[PDB]
Amino acid sequence: SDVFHLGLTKNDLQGATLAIVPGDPDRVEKIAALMDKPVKLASHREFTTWRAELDGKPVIVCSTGIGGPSTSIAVEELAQLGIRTFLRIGTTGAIQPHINVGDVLVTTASVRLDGASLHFAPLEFPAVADFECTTALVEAAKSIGATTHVGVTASSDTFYPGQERYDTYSGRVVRHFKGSMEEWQAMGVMNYEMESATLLTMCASQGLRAGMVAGVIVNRTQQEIPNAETMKQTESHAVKIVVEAARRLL
Amino acid sequence: KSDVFHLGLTKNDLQGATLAIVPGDPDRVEKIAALMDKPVKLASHREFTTWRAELDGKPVIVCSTGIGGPSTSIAVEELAQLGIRTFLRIGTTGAIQPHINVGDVLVTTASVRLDGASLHFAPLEFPAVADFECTTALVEAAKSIGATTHVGVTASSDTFYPGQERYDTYSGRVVRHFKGSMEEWQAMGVMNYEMESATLLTMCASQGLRAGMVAGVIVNRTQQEIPNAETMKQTESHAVKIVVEAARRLL
Amino acid sequence: SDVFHLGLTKNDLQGATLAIVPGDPDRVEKIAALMDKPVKLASHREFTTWRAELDGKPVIVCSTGIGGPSTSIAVEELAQLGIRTFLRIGTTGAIQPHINVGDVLVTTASVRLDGASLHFAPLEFPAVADFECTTALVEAAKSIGATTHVGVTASSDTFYPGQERYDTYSGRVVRHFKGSMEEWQAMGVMNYEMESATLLTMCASQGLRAGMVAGVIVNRTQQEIPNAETMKQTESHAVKIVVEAARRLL
Amino acid sequence: SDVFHLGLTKNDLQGATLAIVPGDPDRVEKIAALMDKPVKLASHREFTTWRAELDGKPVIVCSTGIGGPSTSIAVEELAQLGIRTFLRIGTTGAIQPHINVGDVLVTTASVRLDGASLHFAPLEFPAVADFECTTALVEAAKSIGATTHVGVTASSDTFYPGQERYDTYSGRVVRHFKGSMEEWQAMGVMNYEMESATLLTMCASQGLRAGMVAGVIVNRTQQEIPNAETMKQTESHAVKIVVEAARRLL
Amino acid sequence: MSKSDVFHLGLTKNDLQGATLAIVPGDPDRVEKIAALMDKPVKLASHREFTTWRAELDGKPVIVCSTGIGGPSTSIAVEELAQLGIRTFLRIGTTGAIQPHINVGDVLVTTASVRLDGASLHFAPLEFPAVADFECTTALVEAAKSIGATTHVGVTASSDTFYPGQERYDTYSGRVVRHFKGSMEEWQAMGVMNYEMESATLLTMCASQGLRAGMVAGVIVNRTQQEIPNAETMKQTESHAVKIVVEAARRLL
Amino acid sequence: KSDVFHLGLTKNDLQGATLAIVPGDPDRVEKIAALMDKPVKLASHREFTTWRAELDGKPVIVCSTGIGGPSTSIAVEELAQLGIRTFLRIGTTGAIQPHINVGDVLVTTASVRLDGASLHFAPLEFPAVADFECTTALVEAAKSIGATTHVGVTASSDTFYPGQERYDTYSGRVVRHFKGSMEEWQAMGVMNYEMESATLLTMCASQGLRAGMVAGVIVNRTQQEIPNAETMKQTESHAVKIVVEAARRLL
């Protein structure tokens, strides 16, 4: 291996410069199966890597795991191996009433409610997505047909208190995050997820291209427990968009 | 007489205009308005000068923000009160990347928040991000009229001197916080310095208003050059041509 | 021109060391008319400069505009040309019930609700006025006769949310400034304006003398809209003091 | 499932109140195998859960993945299921010259270089380990025989810049972390890892007991590349200590 | 012949007679009381709020030196004692409990402190834990068991003020700054035991400089029941805590 | 016996006094009180020593704060409870400017807040500013008795050593935040270091209490580290004379 965690060499990549980066290691094969000649490369900890082909060009699919820290490891080590473009496909909870379950969200930039982004750039630096990647994702969503919303995402280091969930062991939220969801809602923030702030900051401050897309499986203004079939169908719709966007970026 | 505190304008003066081109320099307001059909002076109070024009049969407003976030926040808020929902900023800038030349056009996706006014609308963690449709329109407009264009991050500073790490000053010193800051922004791929985008982009993105940012490069901080007057006017006119062309796509 | 913005040479000043710095460019001519032999030097952007004479000594009047950014440009470039003393005359909204419209406020130091001050000194540094300038302003106010209050001013980077105005497009104020006016009120803060924090910090941290005076045209505890007559009379009232204070400091 | 991510019900735990929480999902089976009646329960994303028996009492082993964010999910959901005591066993890079590879480190408290801890308590709150858990770990290390160091740990949201690694794609470290390792070294900080700040903060501020132990596989003052034999032995050595400590806390 | 090796304490290295441990109360009036519990106590110096006594414990010299109230004077005392050769510091203090289950007369051992002070920042950034030394904490817990006391072990909120930082409204202004409004309830929910005024500075400055520090306090008031402490119970609680800190020092010699 | 928690004073003990002189050193209290009429010791508890005296027929309190903001905040609050509305601090200081000599008198207009206690009364953005009347009285008193006086900004630190960038210590290190800080304050025109003014000035200015700050220079950091044990006594006597004369002007 050429890297500390991923278990990959430069040769394993076969000249690939683009990586699709899901959070869930189980999503990796599912994404790679959508493309030509899918091949398993490695699996260590939360990092599962597959190689495939898109229009005759080698492409990488690699899981980040949940959160900025494991994301930062995966992205850094992929960058060492030659990856220059990163496309994140994730799941999300929407916080705006007009966004429905099954909708697709493309992130222009993220609210930095994480710690890892600060290890690459000070807070004043925008967690902004690459313009070409964002364009490709928006065009891909319009290509396959989806209800799409474009805007700001709140990227949190926690699933519970940082997203103002009170259905917890303690049932309390720290002062800093008390009333925070309502504030983000008023500011037009679309949704909550857990990796985009880190990914977008670390790429935008290091000359790497990054894009972010997510499928809405829950809306916080109406529900908390989603359906275990609409979840899989929403994932498949978002996976279709991210692969189509990758086509436009090769 | 007046529906707002500072601009000295009424809702009827706008005639149903929803878009506004917002330059920093008050003398540039006439320059932009003259490029469009039927230019009319509306009001001139303090640093705020407002001209109304017509683009493709649709009314368009041109309003000076003045230098910096504070007066920009006054202008944008009061225009929004009057009915403006789309704001396109055209400015001047100093590039900090060696590959960006004088005369180049820069479209800002998002800004480094080295200002104070943005914090009055959203906490620092909120991205000073431009509207996607506005950014697209500016990029397309730059390609339409033909320009050397760079798209990326801008450092938006509350000062011209210390916040942009200028040492050619009265004191000759820069506060610890900004010492070595230019080199840091350079390494992070930040294209340039200006003084209004962080405030404009934050206050619009956090209030459901669309904002775009474009600037003409009149100086590059890495090369030994003294700003030329003839090139300064040419670059201004070039950037003005793009912001008007982009406004056509957003109405 | 020897400066980037003001459009003045060192010779244009004629050895002037004191400058009266108003916010309104339309107020420069008003202040210059109170002194002997007024001459318009330059008008560029929001910066309008007039050269006048006070007691056989040249005095500069130069507009800063609203807010710290242009104030920082104006003060720095005047310092480059040779100005060592700065006297700000402004308008203000009082937040204490005992301060009336038409009253004159002399600022000892300012609450730093601005960004530009941080570009000269860290937040812990006091936005304090020069003792001689403050003395001169207090003495000048007592000389011409005025209802004067001396104390702390809140200097904000915005007119609306930073001064907790809700009569706005959004009708919302960010969490940080929610309930802030009541807090400043309890702390004995007299008023809101938009330039003093920047001016006082940048002068006190660079060996320049600065003073701050303002006329009350609005009181936030009673009424938001001022008329026409009282507004103009308060401005003329305040201008007289700043010229009289300049006489003591030369 | 009773929880969102772990795929576990309260019944699955059989009355367990203690969990051993490694970062690596592959380590879960290894820890469980040291105890009686080891049984696999679930595996979803980076969360692999096993149940075993210690002195007749049920005990849980559950991987957190790398970093505070996924740790915060695992710890929250385990708490919901009934876990009250959390013992982390991890890997670490030592930054003190006197600490050797193969040594065992017990963390009293952590430097909070993470984001997730802030979602439970403000920065001023100490990321402190539970006294009983720390005692048990120190006693367990003394029981099986190990070279043990007790003290402060730097817990970082990144593996690279936050631990001041320059052997990276960019080769740069953000200003905030430039010279940070030398600072921690002078302050007597023993080591770097990636989960303790989150774990210790979230437990100490929610009435949960937490302990932290780690095996040194690298010392940053001498070498960077760990050997894949000492690594396995150090892990085994640390696993035996955490299991013995768990015995003392039942 | 020689008067002082340090700026404030008015002590020479010889005054210490080879002592490496110091008991550091906040109150200069408490110094004699602690010293009197050990063998052959003698007053060494008294300057400002720094009163110093030396005494003998199991044939080994021990220093008792007051810090005064707050981090600033604590930082002076600890630093100058360290210059004089002290390597182990044991703080004995008074405290106001904020948990309902902790009673007046109870003894609290601090594992680590919430840093509501300024002086700790002069030694380490806020992210650094104001954590007590493990051996010192162990010795204090064992000493509390030894002499018999109702003991609670956990986190302490260490404040730069007695009033607003501890959310007291019974004041001249009757107001508390936004930052500390509702702060007590927050600390209570986080399981914080009590308020005092020196531990954050002491623990941070020692833990970041290779010095061993321990923290123990006697509860003279519980904020969820009363505000004014009884004079008699105060003396008994102080005496109870003083006995524990000496017994802990015995285990650390 | 006592109306307050720490000072050991009743309001009756004060005899209607509204002004207090507040030295840091409890042993300086008797020295200040001896300069006025009818000096009597009232209480001595912890670092708080209180004397009462008479100035032009008006009762005045002298009460020590101890070193640092925390004990200062207790003393000031509890004196305010007893009816004190005007506070005058007399202290010792180390000058950091080359032009300020040992024996000079410094009047503080406002303080750099390098303390923690000030934050418990007002957020950092609030200026640690002295009362204008108190500052005036101190400047006039210094000119009255004759002294080399400097007026300006003071750095008020929660530590004597690292916060004032002293390296002559046990560890020999200074935390990153304060590394190079003295040079920064020097460039910013900060006169000196002391340990109570930020707390005192912030807590008074934000609670409607009048506060003044004066200090005698016993060390200049650019020329020495150790004060002279004779010039110290002379300088203290000098400053004490000024604070009593200022107190005369404020009754």
Ligand SMILES: O=c1[nH]c(=O)n(COCCO)cc1Sc1ccccc1
């Ligand atoms: O509300 C959310 N917040 C969020 O950060 N994500 C992203 O995925 C993080 C790991 O589940 C996904 C959702 S949607 C959801 C709601 C309940 C259970 C699982 C997912």
Ligand SMILES: O=c1[nH]c(=O)n(COCCO)cc1Sc1ccccc1
């Ligand atoms: O370096 C710059 N920084 C910057 O913030 N701007 C934007 O215009 C602000 C007011 O001139 C423009 C420039 S380019 C320049 C260089 C020298 C003199 C005037 C403009």
Ligand SMILES: O=c1[nH]c(=O)n(COCCO)cc1Sc1ccccc1
């Ligand atoms: O409330 C105020 N806040 C404030 O920052 N200022 C200073 O002048 C800013 C430009 O009008 C002046 C006032 S008074 C006022 C009230 C309504 C309209 C214009 C001024």
Ligand SMILES: O=c1[nH]c(=O)n(COCCO)cc1Sc1ccccc1
């Ligand atoms: O230096 C370190 N920093 C650190 O945070 N850890 C903890 O485990 C993080 C995931 O590998 C482990 C180590 S030791 C090391 C050194 C080289 C490659 C892999 C681990």
Ligand SMILES: O=c1[nH]c(=O)n(COCCO)cc1Sc1ccccc1
């Ligand atoms: O609530 C407290 N807060 C606190 O910081 N301490 C510690 O000693 C500080 C100086 O008395 C002690 C107490 S208990 C108390 C209550 C009322 C009057 C005196 C002490």
Ligand SMILES: O=c1[nH]c(=O)n(COCCO)cc1Sc1ccccc1
């Ligand atoms: O440099 C100083 N910094 C400072 O904060 N003070 C104020 O008095 C604090 C307790 O001595 C006094 C001085 S002068 C000095 C220098 C060496 C030993 C004692 C006093």
Ligand SMILES: [K+]
């Ligand atoms: K302006």
Ligand SMILES: [K+]
């Ligand atoms: K993870």
Ligand SMILES: [K+]
């Ligand atoms: K003290």
